[PDB]
Paper text:
Thioredoxin (Trx), glutaredoxin (Grx), and peroxiredoxin (Prx) are redoxin proteins that are important in regulating a variety of cell redox-related processes. BNP7787 (Tavocept, Disodium-2,2'-dithio-bis-ethanesulfonate) is a novel, water soluble disulfide that has been evaluated in oncology-related clinical studies, and interaction of BNP7787 with different redoxin proteins has been a focus of research in our laboratory. Herein, structure function data including activity assays, mass spectrometry characterizations, and X-ray crystallographic studies, elucidating interactions between BNP7787 and human Grx 1, human Prx 1, and human Prx 4 are presented.
Peroxiredoxin (Prx) reduces hydrogen peroxide to water and alky peroxides to their corresponding alkyl alcohols. BNP7787-modified Prx 4 also forms a donut shaped decamer. The BNP7787-derived mesna moiety was found to form a mixed disulfide with Cys 124 in all molecules of the decamer. In some molecules, the BNP7787-derived mesna moiety is bound in multiple conformations. To accommodate the BNP7787-derived mesna moiety, it appears that residues 121-126 undergo a conformational change partially unwinding the helix and exposing Cys 124. Specifically, Tyr 266 and Phe 267 of the native Prx 4 structure form a hydrophobic patch on the C-terminal helix and would normally occupy the same space as the BNP7787-derived mesna moiety and Cys 124. However, the whole protein mass spectrometry indicated that 2 molecules of BNP7787-derived mesna were present and, given that Cys 148 was not modified in the crystal structure, the data support a second BNP7787-derived mesna adduct on Cys 245.
Numbering used by the authors:
A (entry chain E), B (entry chain E), C (entry chain D), D (entry chain D), E (entry chain C), F (entry chain C), ...: 77 to 242
Write the structure that this text describes.
């Protein structure tokens, strides 16, 4: 657990699925933009992926405030792609507008203190990192409870307001 | 930082101001009830204490779901009392329905990983602890951004739903 | 890496997909039989899983000489199930008669000395464990090169011949 | 505790309330003058702050012999200000001519050996620091017993006599 | 050393000169009474021993409030006796009513944190110990400056008042 | 030991018997060619050396794919030469085309993790090393079971194919 | 190693060739008898084993004075047998009435302090051990220089006379 | 301590009483001269200082052979002076022509290995040091037994003759 | 050195020559009497052994005060005998009335702090041990300078007198 | 022990008796020739010194093969002389042609691993050092049993022959 508020967010890099393709992605790619970086447990469970979908549907509300969204699980990039290429009808994600980062080595998860050593995947963790790479907000949820796009928006808008008028 | 999701929330005890009086309070007093335990930086700043007030106004929405709310800063119990006995007109808290816990020794703050060694007070941290004493949720905000009573409610309701139907 | 020829094979347990269902599985369940226990890198890659298919399709050549086969990768059991439910025409596994063990936490791969720290998955490693639970054979292949069912059969038959005839 | 008679007094700096305003203050600002530097436990307690008032009210007996006085507790500068803006008729300090230094982080109290680990505040400790920045006198009192301005004057006058006459 | 306010005063024992005779003396002998225990630097110096005389002349004022007085230096008991047997006129102490404790080994001075490693004697240190053997007060003066019987009397009386009156 | 897949094979050197003569041999001599490097337990045992013979008879099949073969045991070079100079009829190896490396000091066996501390010799271990000196394959057999030239040939060919064809 | 004059000779055990057969042999088998215990470098070298031949051919000069002889090298027991089955005319040992002790593990050589770490065999070490198993003599020779049967007899005879006549 | 025969005598320096005055004195002041350096327990005891008196009264027997004498105890220089100003008739030293070295810190006594940790003074130690500052003699006596001026002279004379005549 | 005044003299034992005969001698044999224990450098040197002969000649003066005398050097007991058996004319000791203790191992000299590590023998050390085995006196002379019997008598008589008469 | 075959013989130096005279002798003085370096227990014992006399008598047989002989014990050089000067009739060595090296410090015996810590002397060790200072041979006899000059010649001639003729 290296993630500490008002300290630079721990650096990550890896392979993400972006618009159906493998792309290399790293935290510094988002420098100059605010980033919502969130973790979810696993691809292909029997629980509908409403969060990822929800952030995906409302991506323009983040893009209109100079904010990007990246989702991460410990699954491989190949699983992410397979999950994306599986139709929602069949319990897949369907096409998605948000990068799916793979944390196969588990190092990113550990560095963000969201890794569950017992399970080998993460809990539901969400991070708001500013345009300067500084961690501004940490949200950790026990597995069965998801996240509010509305509340993430409120938080992003609030830090940006604070940045300008403070 | 001992606070870990789905692990027992770190034990605390100390003096709180409750209904204008000094009372000893400890985490175990809340066993059997869900607890919203939150930290704020300092009493008597020039910023209106809207959060404490907001949780105070809407306390019955928590009590109707078997949930209590406790606020904490590193200020002494005496400061808390003085802040409470100072009218909102003059920048005080005014009377309040929520216990104000004092973390004078700073140990509670450290155990919850919300202490700022540089400042000697906390950031805005919020914790949702269940009826069995288990940490379910951790919310850490950089100083200038407050908390949503609505979002805390959503979270408490969600964990209780999960407790019954899961 | 605690796997040593002529020493008991490191104990392992985890969730496996056995005929489309999640079952807890352990090394000790194989006591009384020879076990071929092999690691492959990742589900859902763009290589045909010819080698896993081969062991599954020729499984009776193993069972008729008192031998089972168990496959393992670092993928979750949910990824394993989905891969199984992907037809071979689409580079999936199709239905399979061999258990697919999940090593999500990586402990089993590490105990077997097959984990790759920088990739987060295993290489191609195969282990032949006798009916007494003793490790008799270790085969470790760099990624691109697969394993022969005929060579595995030869080795199993030879240890068995060796067991019976002094 | 690094405070030693005839050694330089441990350096300190922090925010103080000086005539109703926040000013950064440091030990080195007192170079050239004697300094009486004393700790009291807590603002806003149910004891009249007779002892602080005494030093403030007789401040000229110190300034006319080249001596300043600085008070300190672990309270924040915001608590100090509020206490100052509480009239003596209501057990506040009323306006005061002596700086009230804040030791929020407790580092100054610890460096002076006056911090109480289990209470989170200091005891009653008073230090006489000469114009060369050297510690000449240490007075440490258990909580209930206060300090005499007359005794402090006597000690200051004696070190000064001693300084001039060999 | 080991002297801390509100902790038992560090135990000591040694030879003292009481009314012109060597007696074994210990801290525990004073249990049930308050004790003013002070250190002075050296016998036979070129300075008049005003402190020790003043405590001896006004002893009944301490005895009448259930308080004893013990003085101590690093000098041997033989030096103490000779100093007493030297008439005040000639730089001696003359007959005295206070015990003169010898701390030849330096251990007592070290335990009270008054020993000066480079000088081989103590600074001017004074300790107020209550009837239960708890240390209530620590006064440490740089060499040139002595102690006030009035002040000491005030502190003893204040601790006894606070003891009894709640 | 130090042998790891996709790392340079641990360096070795020693005396070998090549066409009936002692020659100094080293791993680096084989750079630019593939190398099958294998260990066998002991010369002069009561078992026919079928493995070593088979590799020697079919050597041209390795030479024609730019691959050399080296066999090794803990026996001395003198024992190797005598074993070669013993006719197969009488339990000897007879003339051979593969070098017989001596690992008298045991260091090579230890570096390859094939040494048996309680027996004083190796198990049956086989290593495939590429032309760049990188280790591609590790095969470790419990004592009774030998090695297949077909399998070895298959693995060499597969690594060379994958080398070239992307 | 641990071999020390007038201390018990370091225990050893292992497999030896005794009249064409493999027997387990230990130092304790020689209790009640003097033992000449010697090491030689290697079997099958290009020098006639005149040393070993001589002790064997002259064994009765030892047995008739209650003394046994054991030869040792790091060669395996199979190498020892092959060597014995090689005729003296052809460079071999021919039949021999002294056990050839195998030290494959090197432990015995190391306990006797005769092992050459750089070469992986022994120098020429001879040890005379009495009937109580106490080490009475150590003779260590650099490699090219052999031992004398007459000198060894003289020492044995001398030690026994010494035993008998005080 | 560090005092060793035929090694340089441990350096010392401190304040001594030399003809009624305080002088700083160091071991190096005696280079070019033999030095008799001795320790005695304490000033002002109830035994006449016959030892010290004797060396003082007989000093010319040392000076006429290029030898000086220094006496030391742990007493302060002020105690030494008082003692000197006490008449021999009254138990004191009377005037004395030998320096009385003060060892208040105890360091010198400890360097000479004569300090008694339990008593806080020295035993009776005498040291003969040559003109090059090399320690030639150590005489240590348990407390109740004094030194002989005739023996010390005989040793000094013996060391000088030895120096002169090889 | 382990010898320390007023502590038990380090235990010793060894072989002494007493009236031309080898006897085992121990420090404890002297319990109930005073012991003059002294070391000289070496037997058979060109210096006349005056000290040993002096103590020998005057032995009755010690025995009449219940005191024994033992002489020691690092020489073997055999050297002591030969030296005793060599006439003073031809550079020997001649018959002597004092035990000559051998410290061949050097351990006794080491315990007594008289051993010269660079020479392999002792300087001239003399020790006075009382009837309860407590060391009372340490005399260490640099090599050239011998010891006085008169001085040694004086010290013994002094220790015995102060033992008796308080 | 630091002596090791085929390593440089441990350096030694000391005082030897050579033709009745004290000379400083060093191992390096023997460079360019072979050296028989041997230890015996002690001078002046009741055992006839046959070994030393034998090597002495036959010294020309060594000198004609470019070989010197040095004898050592722990005795002082003075003891060696006296022993040499004592006629064989009266239990001495008598004139001898071989240097008698003194190892008074015991350091040479320790480096050679011949020192008996419990006796303070050596057992019977013999060492053959070549012309380049390399140790070629170690012979260690338990005390009673002496050494043979014929055997020692045989070994020297053997080492020199194998030095020359490859
Ligand atoms: S995945 C949950 C949404 S819906 O497809 O069931 O409508
Ligand atoms: S404290 C902010 C609310 S209001 O009093 O200004 O209305
Ligand atoms: S990816 C598997 C290829 S095939 O099954 O279509 O032959
Ligand atoms: S609390 C202060 C008491 S007074 O100022 O009213 O006298
Ligand atoms: S010695 C005390 C006498 S006075 O200095 O106070 O006059
Ligand atoms: S020694 C090899 C001959 S056979 O056993 O294969 O017949
Ligand atoms: S190894 C036999 C050779 S010879 O000495 O007998 O000639
Ligand atoms: S201290 C003087 C006493 S006496 O020996 O001179 O009698
Ligand atoms: S040691 C020489 C003195 S004397 O015995 O010969 O007199
Ligand atoms: S050492 C006794 C033998 S001999 O020299 O007396 O012949």
């Amino acid at each position: 657990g290296t993630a500490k508020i008002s300290k630079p967010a721990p650096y990550w890099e890896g392979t993400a699925v972006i618009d159906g393709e493998f792309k290399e992605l790293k935290l510094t790619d988002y420098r100059g933009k605010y980033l919502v970086f969130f973790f979810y447990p696993l691809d292909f469970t029997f629980v509908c992926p409403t969060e990822i979908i929800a952030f995906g549907d409302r991506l323009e509300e983040f893009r209109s405030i100079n904010t990007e969204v990246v989702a991460c699980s410990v699954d491989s990039q190949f699983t992410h792609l397979a999950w994306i290429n599986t139709p929602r009808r069949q319990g897949g994600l369907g096409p998605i507008r948000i990068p799916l980062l793979s944390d196969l080595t588990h190092q990113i998860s550990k560095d963000y203190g969201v890794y569950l050593e017992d399970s080998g995947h993460t809990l539901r963790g969400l991070f708001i990192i500013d345009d300067k790479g500084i961690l501004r907000q940490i949200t950790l949820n026990d597995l069965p409870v998801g996240r509010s796009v509305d509340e993430t928006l409120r938080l992003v808008q609030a830090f940006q307001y604070t940045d300008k008028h403070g």
